[PDB]
Amino acid sequence: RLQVEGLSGQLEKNVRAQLSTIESDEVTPDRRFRARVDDAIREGLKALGYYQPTIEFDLVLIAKVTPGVPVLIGGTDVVLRGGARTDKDYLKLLDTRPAIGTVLNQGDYENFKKSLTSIALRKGYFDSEFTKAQLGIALGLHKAFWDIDYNSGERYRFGHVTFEGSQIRDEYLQNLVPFKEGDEYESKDLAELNRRLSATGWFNSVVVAPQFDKARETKVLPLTGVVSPRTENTIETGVGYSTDVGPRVKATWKKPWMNSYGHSLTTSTSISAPEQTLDFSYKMPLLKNPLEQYYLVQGGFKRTDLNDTESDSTTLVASRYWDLSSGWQRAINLRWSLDHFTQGEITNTTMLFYPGVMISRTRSRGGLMPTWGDSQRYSIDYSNTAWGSDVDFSVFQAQNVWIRTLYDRHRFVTRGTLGWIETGDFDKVPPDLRFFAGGDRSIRGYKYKSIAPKYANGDLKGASKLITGSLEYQYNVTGKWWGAVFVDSGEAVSDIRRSDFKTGTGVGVRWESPVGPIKLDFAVPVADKDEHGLQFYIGLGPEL
Numbered sequence: 001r002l003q004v005e006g007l008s009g010q011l012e013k014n015v016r017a018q019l020s021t022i023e024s025d026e027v028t029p030d031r032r033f034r035a036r037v038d039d040a041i042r043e044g045l046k047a048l049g050y051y052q053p054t055i056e057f058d059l060v061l062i063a064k065v066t067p068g069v070p071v072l073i074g075g076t077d078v079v080l081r082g083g084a085r086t087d088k089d090y091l092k093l094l095d096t097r098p099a100i101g102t103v104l105n106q107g108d109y110e111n112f113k114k115s116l117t118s119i120a121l122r123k124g125y126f127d128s129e130f131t132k133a134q135l136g137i138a139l140g141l142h143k144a145f146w147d148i149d150y151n152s153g154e155r156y157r158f159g160h161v162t163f164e165g166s167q168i169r170d171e172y173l174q175n176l177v178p179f180k181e182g183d184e185y186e187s188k189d190l191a192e193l194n195r196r197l198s199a200t201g202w203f204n205s206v207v208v209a210p211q212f213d214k215a216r217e218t219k220v221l222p223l224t225g226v227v228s229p230r231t232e233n234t235i236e237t238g239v240g241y242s243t244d245v246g247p248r249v250k251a252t253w254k255k256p257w258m259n260s261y262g263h264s265l266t267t268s269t270s271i272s273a274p275e276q277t278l279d280f281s282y283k284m285p286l287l288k289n290p291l292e293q294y295y296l297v298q299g300g301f302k303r304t305d306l307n308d309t310e311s312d313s314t315t316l317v318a319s320r321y322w323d324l325s326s327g328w329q330r331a332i333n334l335r336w337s338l339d340h341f342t343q344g345e346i347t348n349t350t351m352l353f354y355p356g357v358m359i360s361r362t363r364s365r366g367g368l369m370p371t372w373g374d375s376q377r378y379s380i381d382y383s384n385t386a387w388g389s390d391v392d393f394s395v396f397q398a399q400n401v402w403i404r405t406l407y408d409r410h411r412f413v414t415r416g417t418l419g420w421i422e423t424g425d426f427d428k429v430p431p432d433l434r435f436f437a438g439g440d441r442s443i444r445g446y447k448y449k450s451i452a453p454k455y456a457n458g459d460l461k462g463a464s465k466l467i468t469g470s471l472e473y474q475y476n477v478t479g480k481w482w483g484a485v486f487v488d489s490g491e492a493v494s495d496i497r498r499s500d501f502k503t504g505t506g507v508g509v510r511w512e513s514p515v516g517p518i519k520l521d522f523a524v525p526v527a528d529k530d531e532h533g534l535q536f537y538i539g540l541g542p543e544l
């Protein structure tokens, strides 16, 4: 074992980090090893300014180190040529230089050099060169002097972008170029072009390559965006199980490009004992803004046989979307639907036609089980008999998911859902538009959609208002395995002045499996004389 002495602050920290690279307690020499320790100490001290120390050993081994005289900064001379002499980023860097008199750190010199080189790369100074770069160390004066003469040249500007291998018409790609021809080069614009192209889903691969062979004389940099068409068909499946609903299967078939206009088609189905759906979604990007703006035409079929609800539904939807890179989506919707249903003893055929608006956003960082993220969705729908709809109503909805991680190991998932349907003919409203609570992602511990007001005969009727929330805490026990504890609470009522909150609580497991996060929850109803017994759930739940 070895020990130091004679170092006060950071000096005793850097030396300790330098010594913990060679093995201490070991069968080793006593005049060849203490020569290895000596070289290390002097190197850690040299980096912090002390060039002329003194070290000496006794016996466990101890080493009396003395810092000695430090070399100070005598001059940080730097001259800049080209656009750098007047460039704000280069000017800003010149202040980072260490003041005269301060103790020398060799890291500051080489890092200043890295920064000169880094800014040139970022801002397109592709003719940048050091004409001089030297650090003079004068031990006689105990002074160090920079001497850098750096010539950046002039900024390169963007040329034309030529695309290769695209199955999509070129005009769509040109309208995704975030810069104008002639704009001053900026590295993040290339990154943004790559991002935008990839985000369309049109391509298997995207590589934007600058053509330096040409831009040497003109200082105008043409780009070549070579792409490969996306796989024409993709099929994802998914399976889940819950004690109340039973097994559940989802499958989606994506055709991320249907033609050279960049249209895409998604066919989806969700199958369980009580509910079955089949949906189609056809997307048509607008030429002016192919990524941010598009039309959606959706058509769907649904069948429900659940509790006191029997229903079959058909719907068509036309939507106009405005998406932002910030994550916000904004849409105007126009929905038509036909619903044949029986709720309790009430049977009806209802045709609806109504517009609506939707605002949403989803953010995520950390992968499939994100460490941080959130999702928000707010919508308003308005049906009116004046334009052919069978029922007058207004539906307001809001939902939130918030995910945050503390100290790498403590993950908090918070959810909240609000729903309000205002109408004077509730009996004609299809069950799908009414509110029921209970079940996973509603109130765990209660049966799927079992919570709602009832007809006089005891049959479920559905609610005109919905309020639910959940607090969940997860702890990363080991590796990819987490323990979870949660409480869910909410109500589905038709008179908000008359509360009837139901609360469920439970514990669970989470596993970051190769195919994504797998959850397992056990849950019971809390303080309910009418409801007892454990519900459990297993699946690939998304959280957000």
Ligand SMILES: CCCCCCCCCCCCCC(=O)OC[C@H](COP(=O)([O-])OCC[N+](C)(C)C)OC(=O)CCCCCCCCCCCCC
Pocket: 258, 259, 260, 261, 263, 280, 281, 282, 297, 298, 299, 300
């Ligand atoms: C709820 C959904 C409602 C359906 C909405 C559909 C709306 C469709 C309107 C637009 C049609 C496409 C316009 C178009 O561009 O047409 C031509 C296009 C080919 O053009 P191209 O220049 O690539 O030539 C080929 C490439 N080459 C020249 C290099 C060889 O052909 C195609 O897109 C043919 C494929 C289009 C099929 C769409 C199927 C929709 C129905 C799904 C089922 C829903 C049931 C409820």
Ligand SMILES: CCCCCCCCCCCCCC(=O)OC[C@H](COP(=O)([O-])OCC[N+](C)(C)C)OC(=O)CCCCCCCCCCCCC
Pocket: 247, 248, 249, 250, 251, 252, 253, 267, 268, 269, 271, 272, 273, 274, 276, 278, 305
């Ligand atoms: C590659 C795509 C894979 C899709 C998924 C594969 C099939 C998964 C079946 C899972 C069934 C287990 C759950 C179950 O028990 O569910 C029962 C359900 C209806 O049973 P039920 O009416 O006798 O009584 C229903 C009412 N009660 C039970 C209260 C009396 O079963 C059904 O709906 C069966 C629906 C079968 C659909 C056949 C495939 C069409 C896919 C087209 C679109 C694909 C786009 C990607």
Ligand SMILES: [Cl-]
Pocket: 285, 286, 287, 288
């Ligand atoms: Cl268009």
Ligand SMILES: [Cl-]
Pocket: 317, 333, 334, 335, 356, 381
């Ligand atoms: Cl809608």
Ligand SMILES: [Cl-]
Pocket: 343, 346, 426, 427, 428, 461
């Ligand atoms: Cl009814």
